[PDB]
């Protein structure tokens, strides 16, 4: 084990993060609340919402995209447009109606990892070629340094920084503006299949193919708490909006949910058969939504973690899914090649 020196310029950023990060927590606590209690509303209201979510939803339409399965779909912060990535292609679609779409582009890359929106005109996409592309969506630059395929990419909650996580045991922290390598990080011993950023913008948790969920403090660059629970590769790492809980998924058909703040260890939802691809929490406001190759799609409480409901409209396996910010949409990319809007 070594401490590596260097990169003062990045050092500057850590300060920025600290100022930004530190100020965020008080607001998060205010959002959390507690004082009102009045349990009846919650149990009636929260329960009612969960029941509705897991009890009515259905297909609206299917749609098509390409002839390769669809590897990533993402909704914009206004939830009006979807981006769909094929093994080799993507196009941007209109949330409500879908159908015709706006317009397609065949990017220079052949097999698409993940696609993400800037929180505030831009997207970002990672793929097989080891090159991340900053897109301007009209009514920007390429990122270099990665040898292998890049599985996941995310925008810091802040807004300034992009972090990339690929296959060669390197998750790389990147700036949007300058397109520079702010941090080259090591520490897993095989592939690293996801990187997640947690809502105060303090911490990133890395899932890997070595079944070790490994937390990381961006500001000190210190490996913090290693999580062991998954006896197969950990595909998705989904952070929670509250910011004190994380959730993971894996080849083993399990979802672990670890809360560092409450010292709650891990509560395992036994979710799915046949893998898990992408777990998603509900952004605004509790619910979990996940996708495996079982063809079903699930709905979970964040309090009991009892499975509530499941929905089957896919004929094939599901690579990835994203859910409406209000929570009136659910968009799931079918393994076969459609994009299915869930009510």
């Amino acid at each position: 084990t070594w401490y590596h020196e260097g990169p003062n310029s990045l050092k500057v950023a850590r300060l920025w993060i600290a100022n930004y990060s530190l100020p965020r927590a008080m607001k998060r606590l205010e959002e959390a609340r507690l004082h009102k209690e009045i349990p009846e509303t919650t149990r009636t209201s929260q329960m009612q919402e969960l029941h509705k979510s897991l009890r009515s939803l259905n297909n609206f339409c299917s749609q098509i995209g390409d002839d390769r399965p669809i590897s990533y779909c993402h909704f914009s912060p206004n939830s009006k447009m979807l981006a769909t990535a094929c093994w080799s292609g993507l196009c941007k679609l209109w949330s409500v109606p879908d159908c015709n779409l706006l317009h397609t582009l065949r990017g220079h890359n052949t097999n698409v990892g993940a696609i993400v929106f800037h929180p505030k005109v831009n997207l970002a996409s990672c793929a097989a070629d080891g090159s991340v592309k900053l897109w301007s969506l009209d009514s920007v630059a390429d990122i270099e340094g990665h040898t292998v395929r890049v599985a996941r990419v995310m925008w810091h909650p802040s807004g300034r920084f992009l972090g990339t996580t690929c296959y060669d045991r390197s998750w790389r922290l990147w700036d949007l503006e300058a397109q520079e390598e702010i941090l080259h990080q090591e520490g897993h011993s095989m592939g690293v299949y996801d990187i997640a950023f947690h809502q105060d913008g303090s911490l990133a948790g890395t899932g890997g193919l070595d079944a070790f969920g490994r937390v990381w403090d961006l500001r000190t660059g210190r490996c913090i708490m290693f999580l062991e629970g998954h006896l197969k590769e950990i595909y998705g790492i989904n952070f929670s909006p509250n910011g004190y809980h994380i959730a993971t998924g894996s080849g083993d058909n399990t979802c672990k949910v670890w809360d560092l703040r409450q010292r709650r260890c891990v509560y395992t939802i036994p979710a799915h058969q046949n893998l898990v691809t992408g777990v998603k929490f509900e952004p605004i406001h509790n619910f979990l939504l996940t996708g495996a190759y079982d063809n079903t799609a699930k709905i979970w409480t964040h309090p009991g973690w009892s499975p509530l409901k499941t929905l089957a409209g896919h004929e094939g396996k599901v690579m990835g899914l994203d859910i409406s910010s209000d929570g009136q949409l659910i968009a799931t990319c079918s393994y076969d090649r459609t994009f299915k809007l869930w009510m």
Binding site: E228, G229, T254, P270
Partner: protein, 167 residues
């Protein structure tokens, strides 16, 4: 992993195999030697399964589940009203899973014995989750009975397993 080999690598092998043998026998006649013609599982984590059924009444089913659990070093438990859990190395579970689903017939009919005598009896099984856990607090595999749905939870409650039951 397996290699095959062609027709001509059979001949050459068959002939060079035969030749050595017959010539070795030939000298033996010249020389005058011969008259002239443990429970398995993984320590670091723990694979697990969970199963859920309508009836366990048949004893032949009640017995197998006690044996194989002790036979394969599966930790775990079982419960019912008036679910099944198993944990071990991943090889163990797969055997047991095969048993519960494909071998054993839960829909089959059996004639049970009561305190008075024998009577006929005329249920389904399906898996819920398989997965991975930080530690398996189950010490041994302990079949039991609960009257309610609550102490049933408190049973699992001891193991922080309340959630494994699904209504």
């Amino acid at each position: 992993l397996g290699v095959y080999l062609t027709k001509k690598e059979q001949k050459k092998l068959r002939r060079q195999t035969r030749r050595e043998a017959q010539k070795e026998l030939q000298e033996k006649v010249r020389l005058g030697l011969m008259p002239p013609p443990l429970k398995e599982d993984i320590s670091q984590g723990v694979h697990i399964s969970v199963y859920r059924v309508r009836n366990l009444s048949n004893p032949a089913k009640k017995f197998k589940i006690e044996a194989n659990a002790g036979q394969l070093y599966l930790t775990g438990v079982v419960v019912l009203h008036k679910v099944v859990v198993v944990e071990g190395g991943p090889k163990a579970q797969k055997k047991f899973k095969r048993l519960m689903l494909h071998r054993i017939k839960w829909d089959e009919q059996t004639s049970n014995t009561k305190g008075d005598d024998d009577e006929e009896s005329d249920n389904k099984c399906v898996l819920v989750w398989e997965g991975t856990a930080k530690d398996r607090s189950f010490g041994e595999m302990k079949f039991k009975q609960c009257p309610t749905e609550n102490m049933a939870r408190e049973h699992f409650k001891k193991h922080g397993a309340e959630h494994y039951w699904d209504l």
